[model samples]
Target chain A: GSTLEDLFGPLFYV
Target chain B: DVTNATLETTGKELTETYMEMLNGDVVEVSIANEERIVSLLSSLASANVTLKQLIGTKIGVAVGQFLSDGFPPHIVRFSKGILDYWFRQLPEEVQKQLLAKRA
Candidate 1:
């Protein structure tokens, strides 16, 4: 979706 | 997503999971992250997610022309435009951060 869908490191952010 | 999750554009609201991912995993997630308290405040601000539900309801409420005709295009254009604005003005560091992770 944005930034190739991830990158910037994943956190689940949930 | 939370380390510094790119929570972009207000019209669109993503749940905490995405935010946490954007921020960072650290693997050792903070206990605070697991607590309901953190979500409580944001949930309160967003009217406990009920407001978002209502917005969806509004979309459903649209009559023939505005529903069939205007909503999709307007929402798409506006959301995209806002996202574009975000891309232009968002910190260069963020773009760099995303690029750094590129594989």
Candidate 2:
């Protein structure tokens, strides 16, 4: 149930 | 858009990965990367090398570096595309769980 953010951390795509 | 800042943040993720692996918490980061590659590659259209081939190579390279560098953040940037792809691919329930994890 973990998100990618939870696994890999925050994703900042700017 | 890979950037230095992105790599730095990824480094932090890798740090967590290292600790998690030792405790048998999150599981193998390398295996996780490889496991998702199949679905990700299938999602790409035949014509899009960037999403398929190039990105695939990037992930491979990153995993290699991760092992070599003792879980450095360098590979985190390359993983962005796959992370984004799988993020959208998660089931609604899973997505909700992920969102809650953020909070």
Candidate 3:
């Protein structure tokens, strides 16, 4: 499901 | 989530509103700039929120199961809080089972 929200990844904030 | 972290939102708890829906049956709800849990959490941390003071409580199983599955350090904090507040408590087996999963 990580693909569902790329923003969900840990590095999304960076 | 407070002040709408825009990018990180790490402190925000996952909730029914926080996720997206492709099938389009659900809705999003935001409150007070913080994720809804923050009010209760901050109140509890500040010793203001009480068990009887709950609103918008969740009463079902969630897919993520972070506390039971992820072993986040804060679950220990909650357990400690319960032990500190409640005079009566669980037996050693429950304590052992919970503590053994700590990462």
Candidate 4:
């Protein structure tokens, strides 16, 4: 629900 | 609706905290960012993820952010603040359990 990411980087933290 | 996918991505960024980023323009940004992180943590809990998983994720995210963004003091401070906020939001029962576990 946040508009902040997938704007860049992986979907999850390792 | 908030999904784990969204939290997965956002959580990493949220973990990227440094003290240098806590002041000036970054303060406002971090405040908003922290709010979303808290919200997502709540959603994740509702989704039945264990608190341990969430805490580990937060740690991993912070580490990843530290590597990617470098050790900015502001980021560290902001992350700490966000974490403290989340800690404060825990139910008294959970807090008590956490204390007992640590003790």
Candidate 5:
């Protein structure tokens, strides 16, 4: 849902 | 002339296609250079072929009175303001994948 997420991969917090 | 029926129908098809690209994204839109986000998506040209054909349905006009331009505007909006949101607004549960037994 975030363009920044697509770059350098997304961050996961789960 | 362009009608709401045409707009809405094209919108649905566009969303479905992008969702497929995302697995869960673009093409067919024209721009002067490679800077626009829509052009970036079009980098995947085969799928862009599908997207390009669809954008022939609607885009690059008064469509976005927003902060961006063209279908680049539409694509930026898709993940939020429309398209994908339009899909979730439908309230899918099994998904188009799971419910293939019907359609």
Candidate 6:
């Protein structure tokens, strides 16, 4: 939802 | 992703070697330093610190080392997630070799 969020992206469980 | 430089250093497999969130209702955690999955073990310790008495915890995603000053506040949680991601993406054989090294 934020810029940092965009670069870092989302962590996956797999 | 350039051309000539591409052939010499590019055209490579995922140099596999192999983040984070929730502070309000969740426990906070931090473990970041670098992100070059393939070379981390050479620089990293085998495993890490104590739970700091925080029993519950949490992630989003992250990568890179030159990503240095690029990180925002509370950026450490990304370490473990990226480490896990790198291993999962490596060739089946290399993954085991890295794990064996740690063992």
Binned by DockQ into CAPRI classes (incorrect, acceptable, medium, high), candidate 3 is incorrect
TM-score comparison, 1 vs 3, better candidate: 1
- The numbered model that scores best in DockQ is 2
The candidate with the higher TM-score, 2 or 5, is 2
Q: B18-75 in candidate 2: lDDT tens per residue?
A: 4555533333446675444333333331112222322333332332223332332534
> Of models 4 and 6, which has the larger lDDT?
4
Could you tell me the lDDT of residue B61 within candidate 5?
17
For model 6, what is the error of residue B77's alpha carbon versus the real structure, in angstroms, after optimal superposition? 1.1
Residue B52 of model 5, lDDT score:
28
Give per-residue CA lDDT, model 4, range B6-103, as digits (tens): 55665655554333345543343456554554554444333333344344344334423432333345544444444454445656676565555444
Could you tell me which 10 consecutive residues in candidate 5 chain B have the lowest summed lDDT? B44-53
Ranking by lDDT: 4, 2, 5, 6, 1, 3
In candidate 1, stretches whose alpha carbon ends up further than 4 angstroms from where it belongs are A1-14, B1-71, B99-103
Q: Higher lDDT: candidate 1 or 5?
A: 5
Q: Which residue pairs clash within candidate 5?
A: B21-B25, B22-B25, B27-B48, B27-B52, B28-B52
Candidate 6 per-residue C-alpha lDDT over B1-103 given as tens digits, one digit per residue, 9 for 90 to 100: 1123322121121112112323444433334323333234222223321111011111112233212333333333444444454445445765455345445
Highest-scoring model, lDDT: 4
Q: What does candidate 3's lDDT look like per residue over B8-101, in tens digits?
A: 1322343332343113533323344234433433333333222221111221111122223222335324423432332123245533443444
- 2 versus 3: better TM-score goes to: 2
In model 6, the Cα lDDT at residue B38 comes to 28
True contacts kept of each: 0.03, 0.12, 0.00, 0.00, 0.00, 0.17
Better candidate by DockQ, 2 or 4: 2
lDDT of 5 by residue, B3-99 (tens): 4454445444444443333321233343432234343333222121122222344332112221233335455553233222222333255234323
**What residue runs in model 2 are displaced by over 4 Å at the alpha carbon?**
A1-6, A9-14, B1-78
lDDT of model 1 at position B13: 30
Judged by DockQ cut-offs, is candidate 2 incorrect, acceptable, medium or high? incorrect
